[PDB]
Amino acid sequence: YGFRPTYGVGHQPYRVVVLSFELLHAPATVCGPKKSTNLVKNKCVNFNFN
């Protein structure tokens, strides 16, 4: 390449990272971030424990 700092934007070096995902018939181990809130008591409310 021969990257020089005085080159134009079209010739500047660009770091590219590509993420790939694969799914199979095996138990998956990668998932996405979750939520989780607070904890109230003595009230008729809906809950979701895991």
Partner 1 sequence: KNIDGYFKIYSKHTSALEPLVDLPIGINITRFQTLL
- Closest approach, Cβ 34 to partner 1, in A, equals 19
The residues that touch partner 1, with contacts defined as CB under 8 A, are 25-27, 29
CB of 6 to partner 1, least distance (A): 53
**In whole angstroms, how close is the CB of 31 to partner 1 at the nearest point?**
12
CA distances for 2 relative to 5, 9, 12, 20, angstroms: 10, 14, 10, 30
CA 46 to chain CA centroid, Å, is: 29
